[PDB]
Design an enzyme around this catalytic site. Structure first.
Site, PDB file in Angstrom:
ATOM      1  N   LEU A  17       8.881   6.676   3.891  1.00 27.29           N
ATOM      2  CA  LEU A  17       8.804   7.295   2.570  1.00 27.29           C
ATOM      3  C   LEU A  17       7.354   7.442   2.129  1.00 27.29           C
ATOM      4  O   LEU A  17       6.845   8.565   2.090  1.00 27.29           O
ATOM      5  CB  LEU A  17       9.624   6.474   1.573  1.00 27.29           C
ATOM      6  CG  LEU A  17      11.064   6.175   2.006  1.00 27.29           C
ATOM      7  CD1 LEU A  17      11.853   5.522   0.885  1.00 27.29           C
ATOM      8  CD2 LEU A  17      11.763   7.442   2.476  1.00 27.29           C
ATOM      9  N   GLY A  18       6.668   6.352   1.810  1.00 21.48           N
ATOM     10  CA  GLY A  18       5.282   6.395   1.365  1.00 21.48           C
ATOM     11  C   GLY A  18       4.371   5.711   2.369  1.00 21.48           C
ATOM     12  O   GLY A  18       4.749   4.707   2.978  1.00 21.48           O
ATOM     13  N   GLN A  19       3.168   6.259   2.529  1.00 19.25           N
ATOM     14  CA  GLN A  19       2.172   5.746   3.468  1.00 19.25           C
ATOM     15  C   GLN A  19       0.914   5.401   2.677  1.00 19.25           C
ATOM     16  O   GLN A  19       0.122   6.287   2.339  1.00 19.25           O
ATOM     17  CB  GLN A  19       1.877   6.766   4.564  1.00 19.25           C
ATOM     18  CG  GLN A  19       1.293   6.165   5.832  1.00 19.25           C
ATOM     19  CD  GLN A  19       2.353   5.539   6.719  1.00 19.25           C
ATOM     20  OE1 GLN A  19       3.492   5.339   6.298  1.00 19.25           O
ATOM     21  NE2 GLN A  19       1.984   5.234   7.958  1.00 19.25           N
ATOM     22  N   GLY A  20       0.733   4.113   2.381  1.00 21.61           N
ATOM     23  CA  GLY A  20      -0.420   3.644   1.649  1.00 21.61           C
ATOM     24  C   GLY A  20      -1.466   3.006   2.554  1.00 21.61           C
ATOM     25  O   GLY A  20      -1.343   2.960   3.776  1.00 21.61           O
ATOM     26  N   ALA A  21      -2.523   2.505   1.914  1.00 16.99           N
ATOM     27  CA  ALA A  21      -3.593   1.851   2.657  1.00 16.99           C
ATOM     28  C   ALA A  21      -3.174   0.457   3.110  1.00 16.99           C
ATOM     29  O   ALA A  21      -3.263   0.128   4.299  1.00 16.99           O
ATOM     30  CB  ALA A  21      -4.857   1.782   1.800  1.00 16.99           C
ATOM     31  N   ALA A  23      -0.055  -1.007   2.775  1.00 15.09           N
ATOM     32  CA  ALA A  23       1.341  -1.192   3.145  1.00 15.09           C
ATOM     33  C   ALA A  23       1.973   0.155   3.471  1.00 15.09           C
ATOM     34  O   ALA A  23       1.338   1.209   3.369  1.00 15.09           O
ATOM     35  CB  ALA A  23       2.117  -1.887   2.023  1.00 15.09           C
ATOM     36  N   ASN A  24       3.245   0.106   3.868  1.00 16.90           N
ATOM     37  CA  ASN A  24       4.052   1.287   4.139  1.00 16.90           C
ATOM     38  C   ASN A  24       5.459   1.044   3.613  1.00 16.90           C
ATOM     39  O   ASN A  24       6.018  -0.040   3.806  1.00 16.90           O
ATOM     40  CB  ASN A  24       4.109   1.606   5.642  1.00 16.90           C
ATOM     41  CG  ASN A  24       2.861   2.324   6.158  1.00 16.90           C
ATOM     42  OD1 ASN A  24       2.758   2.592   7.356  1.00 16.90           O
ATOM     43  ND2 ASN A  24       1.921   2.641   5.271  1.00 16.90           N
ATOM     44  N   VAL A  25       6.029   2.051   2.955  1.00 10.93           N
ATOM     45  CA  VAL A  25       7.352   1.951   2.346  1.00 10.93           C
ATOM     46  C   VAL A  25       8.357   2.675   3.233  1.00 10.93           C
ATOM     47  O   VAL A  25       8.226   3.880   3.480  1.00 10.93           O
ATOM     48  CB  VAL A  25       7.360   2.528   0.921  1.00 10.93           C
ATOM     49  CG1 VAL A  25       8.786   2.640   0.399  1.00 10.93           C
ATOM     50  CG2 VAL A  25       6.523   1.663  -0.007  1.00 10.93           C
ATOM     51  N   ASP A 137      -4.496   3.124 -12.081  1.00  8.70           N
ATOM     52  CA  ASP A 137      -4.183   3.997 -10.956  1.00  8.70           C
ATOM     53  C   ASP A 137      -2.940   4.847 -11.203  1.00  8.70           C
ATOM     54  O   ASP A 137      -2.347   5.359 -10.248  1.00  8.70           O
ATOM     55  CB  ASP A 137      -4.007   3.162  -9.686  1.00  8.70           C
ATOM     56  CG  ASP A 137      -4.462   3.890  -8.438  1.00  8.70           C
ATOM     57  OD1 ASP A 137      -5.665   4.210  -8.342  1.00  8.70           O
ATOM     58  OD2 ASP A 137      -3.619   4.136  -7.550  1.00  8.70           O
TER      59      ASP A 137
HETATM   60  O1  LIG Z   1       4.941   2.510  -3.028  1.00 11.17           O
HETATM   61  C1  LIG Z   1       5.796   1.818  -3.550  1.00 11.17           C
HETATM   62  N1  LIG Z   1       5.454   0.547  -4.086  1.00 11.17           N
HETATM   63  C2  LIG Z   1       4.098   0.048  -4.027  1.00 11.17           C
HETATM   64  C3  LIG Z   1       3.988  -1.176  -4.930  1.00 11.17           C
HETATM   65  C4  LIG Z   1       3.268  -2.271  -5.399  1.00 11.17           C
HETATM   66  C5  LIG Z   1       4.551  -2.025  -5.883  1.00 11.17           C
HETATM   67  C6  LIG Z   1       7.233   2.293  -3.648  1.00 11.17           C
HETATM   68  C7  LIG Z   1       8.198   1.490  -4.274  1.00 11.17           C
HETATM   69  C8  LIG Z   1       9.535   1.929  -4.372  1.00 11.17           C
HETATM   70  C9  LIG Z   1       9.910   3.197  -3.835  1.00 11.17           C
HETATM   71  N2  LIG Z   1      11.103   3.888  -3.772  1.00 11.17           N
HETATM   72  C10 LIG Z   1      10.895   5.041  -3.158  1.00 11.17           C
HETATM   73  N3  LIG Z   1      11.885   6.013  -2.912  1.00 11.17           N
HETATM   74  C11 LIG Z   1      11.554   7.325  -2.381  1.00 11.17           C
HETATM   75  C12 LIG Z   1      12.576   8.231  -2.166  1.00 11.17           C
HETATM   76  C13 LIG Z   1      12.275   9.517  -1.645  1.00 11.17           C
HETATM   77  C14 LIG Z   1      13.366  10.575  -1.378  1.00 11.17           C
HETATM   78  N4  LIG Z   1      13.897  10.408  -0.242  1.00 11.17           N
HETATM   79  C15 LIG Z   1      14.754   9.309  -0.208  1.00 11.17           C
HETATM   80  C16 LIG Z   1      15.739   9.350   0.952  1.00 11.17           C
HETATM   81  N5  LIG Z   1      15.237  10.089   1.976  1.00 11.17           N
HETATM   82  C17 LIG Z   1      14.879   9.488   3.274  1.00 11.17           C
HETATM   83  O2  LIG Z   1      15.035   8.298   3.433  1.00 11.17           O
HETATM   84  C18 LIG Z   1      14.314  10.309   4.453  1.00 11.17           C
HETATM   85  C19 LIG Z   1      14.203   9.389   5.740  1.00 11.17           C
HETATM   86  F1  LIG Z   1      13.237   9.873   6.561  1.00 11.17           F
HETATM   87  F2  LIG Z   1      13.901   8.128   5.367  1.00 11.17           F
HETATM   88  F3  LIG Z   1      15.399   9.383   6.394  1.00 11.17           F
HETATM   89  C20 LIG Z   1      15.108  11.393   1.658  1.00 11.17           C
HETATM   90  C21 LIG Z   1      14.454  11.584   0.285  1.00 11.17           C
HETATM   91  C22 LIG Z   1      10.897   9.788  -1.387  1.00 11.17           C
HETATM   92  C23 LIG Z   1       9.943   8.820  -1.640  1.00 11.17           C
HETATM   93  N6  LIG Z   1      10.281   7.627  -2.126  1.00 11.17           N
HETATM   94  N7  LIG Z   1       9.605   5.121  -2.813  1.00 11.17           N
HETATM   95  C24 LIG Z   1       8.954   3.991  -3.220  1.00 11.17           C
HETATM   96  C25 LIG Z   1       7.605   3.547  -3.121  1.00 11.17           C
END
Ligand SMILES: O=C(NCC1=CC1)c1ccc2[nH]c(Nc3cc(CN4CCN(C(=O)CC(F)(F)F)CC4)ccn3)nc2c1
Ligand SMILES: O=C(NCC1=CC1)c1ccc2[nH]c(Nc3cc(CN4CCN(C(=O)CC(F)(F)F)CC4)ccn3)nc2c1
Lengths: 628, 628
Positions: A17-21, A23-25, A137
């Protein structure tokens, strides 16, 4: 294929989902229940690893619970890599950044959706302030979205508190680019981004090695300007302390939002607000209710923001600020009938109003017909280059333009349909004014008939008396004669109010467009074709390269993307716009003819009151002669 | 992987759409342009291969073009297998069978969407009849759907004409199960399937080796019954010549649709219609327009189907058939004001009406409040078996029930919101009746005051005369005294019409539910969770078996499918239904109190006319005495 795991959770490295410095979600599930959670597997965590400080820290963020904050459920350890994992609630809808990716929001979120963002951000940010932790941020990319049980979106915060052991370049503070002001800066940049659909300060090239101009823009901070953009390479900066025309927000809201962003966007802490000043003015805006008002004079709809405890006097004042109508000249109509509002009536007791069923405003004074004021935007040039990055940005741009045109086309049809109703009500409402004038005429007619009859009878039954009778007989004819002029001139007004009487609303049921045309549905079809292609080009950009077959499909559809857009734009200007301007041209005509008839009906009615006081001085004259 | 190809077209064997006996339909593209087409690669074509007869035949079906018929573009030959390929237009939306798979249509298509199906099927089938070719195999599976440029669906035919060189078991004709009647049979089964969401004739077990009962049902053909279903194994058959209660169609439409299906569903060609009789009655229904009418007496909305050239006399008659209101007792209200309709006014000139802005009907005679009449349906039992086929059928069933409940919940909120308006208009409309009675009272007051004054003056100025004056003086008091009784009793009615006067609409703004509650949005959220699971179970059924991880996810979600449904059903009955029945209970109360006040206001107004003729016989009596 390969997929990490934990004591209680497991996930695939594909599901990212998210690609940070730090960590990775990933999208993960619980091994027992099977419920979806967000897995934050920390990358490169060795030179720190404070299992003493972070232990109590994450335990503090664990119990921290709020509706506007992403919940942290647990801190576990990966099976193999022994990396410490954060288990958070999965937010199915992405981030605010994902919402702004949508072309429908290329020019700003919907007004209703914007109020949800503002309220949740302030509530969450205020909850973090009460705990002392500072964010700095805040960005649409770290503001997640979920769907509440009631269907309305709910926005939450997450990526904060990572500045302990260690702003986005476009959201950085001038002095922090190279105090609590650094907070409100990114907040204002965010709020402008949700209303406009674009960033406040934009150089021509953008955020690159030519971003040197940007730093001069930010350090410029002229007055209470909220944005500054150069339209040419290394050219001057176009400043503005107001919202763009393409902004989907209502005019009443912009008046309240403009001062908020202007006071929180500047390097000087001298004029910059604090968290209390910010929270005070913002919560003030959220507490207000909505008043839908359609001014027939200008053919403009308005949203006036008023607190529920305010009176109708402040209401007339705000309406004057937007419609430029004097408080004593504002006349309200609702559901086919006029409505009288006491100067001290609270806003809680106002009738139920929507943008599709507002309170119409008619004025005695003539006023020009403005109509809808929108930004005319044309299609951009489509280059034959195979650039996947360029085809993706070009897809978002060309589709956002068509979304705007379809949004305008939907607004134009509303104005026309509201106009047809506001006229049908007005003609029947002024017809009621004609029905009461007939009643006040019959009062003077009955008074006339009997009063003159007694004096014309007194001569038949029972030099001096004859001189009085004659003067009275003439006076009775002075009024009954004018009573005959008014009687027939009102039938001429009744002839105008009758169907085909040159005041009928038949023109409005012909000139403009109607929901029967389905012009908005026609545009939505082509708009879906383009939106599907847009999200496909995103998918092709993520791969960085395509196979040969996918390569030519990407080019075929890219050529159909242009053909769809042009087909809609042509149908928008050649059908919707033209037939609207023709409906607006004949709208001025009927307004002049209506206000003219309303001025005639006024005088003729007041003349009945002018002769009503004359017949009271004669009926009580001879009939009340004195004698022992 | 492996994929067939042609001189001009190519496709993958993965991209498969329909699987027939003689051919297979794949999703293909044109090698040059890249436009999508349907590829019909014929399987097992050797013992026939009439390249002489089929050459001219497909060339005839090539030029055959219609809006309600799938277009055949070309007949080409496969590269390798040399199989003859048919290139047709790709229909992106699937078939009518795919639409009926949707739970939203588990109990019948929407009324508007049903009219589209009926019109397109008849137009396409009529076009095939004019060419002589007979179909007999018409089924929702061979009726494709596309989206027109205006956004409205467009349905087309395809799988016909294959009976030359060679009906679905549920759509077979009784005599054909083991003349042109075999055509209309499958058509009627299809139309019943789109309105009800289920098949007309259903045994308990179904179409299996126990389908022996079915053939007895079809050969039974009792009278003009359109359906027959046994609710128990080898039990009796429940017959009905009307539509089910769960049918989403309006009552006015069912009255017209019932005779059509009853005359085309029977083995006997004696009473069965021909293609002309069918086309005549069907096209008659399509030509009619829609009249939206909300009867406040019963709290029921109605859709009356009338031709545009008909008069308001036939309109009152049809309204009587549905609302049971005498034509002379039907009183219309529109946009806050009553509307008088001439007995000979054409339907073309009627005002613009929608189901959310209809014409209200008030009646002098008391009538019971019926409210919405819907079928109470509970959730089915969820078995723990892992059967992928059973979990798919169980998913469609449990979700269709919640779709219906949410559909009803959306209708209940409409009735309440329409009620609140129809009352707010009525109280202000009857208030206008009170405003004109005040005007007619002032006419008698002015007549009273001056007429009595002349006779009370005649005694002061200027046995016999005294006897006349006294009798006149008394008579003037007989009427002025009753004029004082009416004057004060109307202030009591005005006290009732005043806010808080026991007739106010404050109760209606409290008891029921409102769009502020967002109860329909709450149900739609849980309904989306279930719909997503349903389409997932379809995907798992197509694989026939799942991996271990997919196996337990399928079981977790199957358990959440039950929890979502129960959570909605509880919120539907404990919030929406109860608060509606309480709004309907207090609805009867206000109706009685309103019709009572309307009967009082009537008499008191007629009494002003009763004394209006009495003062005309006295004002012209003494004032008009005769003398030389
Ligand atoms: O950075 C965070 N915390 C940092 C911190 C200190 C605290 C954080 C925290 C919680 C979050 N909840 C999410 N949800 C999310 C959902 C989507 C939509 N998406 C979901 C399901 N899909 C897939 O799964 C595709 C695949 F490929 F997986 F199959 C398709 C569409 C996109 C991005 N994000 N992102 C988050 C990020
Ligand atoms: O039988 C026919 N003629 C017989 C005759 C004598 C004349 C006939 C003729 C024309 C048709 N047009 C279609 N369209 C169609 C479309 C769908 C929906 N679907 C389309 C795209 N999707 C895929 O492609 C999935 C995959 F797997 F491919 F990637 C996904 C959804 C489903 C079924 N059908 N069916 C047709 C059938």
């Amino acid at each position: 294929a390969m997929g990490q795991s934990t004591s209680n959770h497991l996930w695939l490295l594909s599901d990212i989902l998210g690609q940070g410095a730090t960590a990775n979600v990933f999208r993960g599930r619980h091994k027992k229940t099977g419920d979806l959670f967000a897995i934050k597997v920390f990358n490169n965590i060795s030179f720190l690893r404070p299992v003493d400080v972070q232990m109590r820290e994450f335990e503090v963020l664990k119990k921290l619970n709020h509706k506007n904050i992403v919940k942290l459920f647990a801190i576990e350890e990966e099976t193999t890599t022994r990396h410490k994992v954060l288990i958070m609630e999965f937010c199915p809808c992405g981030s605010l950044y994902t919402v702004l990716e949508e072309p429908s929001n290329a020019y700003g979120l919907p007004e209703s959706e914007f109020l949800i963002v503002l309220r949740d951000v302030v509530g969450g940010m205020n909850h973090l302030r009460e705990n002392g932790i500072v964010h700095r941020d805040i960005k649409p990319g770290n503001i997640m979205r979920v769907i509440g049980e009631d269907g309305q979106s709910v926005y939450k915060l997450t990526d904060f508190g990572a500045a302990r052991e260690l702003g986005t370049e476009e959201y950085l503070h001038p002095d922090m680019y190279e105090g609590a002001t650094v907070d409100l800066w990114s907040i204002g940049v965010t709020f402008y981004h949700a209303a406009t659909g674009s960033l406040p300060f934009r150089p021509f090239e953008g955020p690159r090695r030519n971003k040197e101009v940007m730093y001069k823009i930010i350090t410029g901070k002229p007055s209470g300007a909220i944005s500054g953009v150069q339209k040419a390479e290394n050219g001057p900066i176009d400043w503005s302390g107001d919202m763009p025309v393409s902004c989907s927000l209502s005019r009443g809201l912009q008046v309240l939002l403009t001062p908020v962003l202007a006071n929180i966007l500047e390097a000087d802490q001298e004029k910059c607000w604090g968290f209390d000043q910010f929270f005070a003015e913002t919560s003030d805006i959220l507490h207000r209710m909505v008043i839908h008002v359609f001014s027939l004079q200008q053919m403009t709809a308005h949203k006036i923001y008023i607190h529920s405890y305010n009176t109708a006097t402040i209401f007339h004042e705000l309406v004057y600020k937007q419609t430029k109508i004097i408080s004593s000249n504002q006349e309200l109509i609702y559901e086919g009938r006029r409505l009288v509002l006491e100067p001290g009536r609270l806003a809680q007791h106002f009738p139920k109003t929507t943008e599709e069923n507002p309170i119409f405003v008619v004025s005695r004074e003539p006023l020009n017909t403005i109509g809808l004021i929108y930004e005319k935007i044309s299609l951009p040039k489509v280059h034959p280059r195979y650039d996947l990055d360029g085809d993706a940005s070009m897809a978002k741009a060309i589709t956002g333009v068509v979304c705007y045109a379809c949004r305008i086309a939907s607004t134009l049809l509303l104005y026309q349909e509201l106009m047809r109703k506001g006229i049908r009500w007005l003609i029947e409402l002024i017809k009621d004014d004609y029905n009461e004038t007939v009643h006040k005429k019959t009062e003077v007619v009955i008074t006339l008939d009997f009063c003159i009859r007694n004096i014309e009878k007194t001569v038949k039954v029972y030099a001096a008396e004859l001189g009085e009778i004659s003067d009275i007989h003439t006076k009775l004819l002075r009024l009954s004669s004018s009573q005959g002029t008014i009687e027939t001139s009102l039938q001429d007004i009744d002839s105008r109010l009758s169907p085909g009487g040159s005041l009928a609303d038949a023109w409005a049921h012909q000139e403009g467009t109607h929901p029967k045309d389905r012009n908005v549905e026609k545009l939505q079809v082509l708009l879906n074709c383009m939106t599907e292609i847009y999200y496909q080009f995103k998918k092709d950009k993520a791969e960085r390269r395509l196979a040969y077959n996918e390569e030519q499909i990407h080019k075929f559809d890219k050529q159909k993307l242009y053909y769809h857009a042009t087909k809609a734009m042509t149908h928008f200007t050649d059908e919707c716009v033209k037939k609207y301007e023709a409906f607006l041209n004949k709208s001025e005509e009927w307004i002049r003819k209506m206000l003219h008839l309303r001025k005639q009906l006024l005088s003729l009615t007041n003349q009945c009151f002018d002769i009503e006081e004359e017949v009271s001085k004669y009926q009580e004259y001879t009939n009340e002669l004195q004698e022992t």
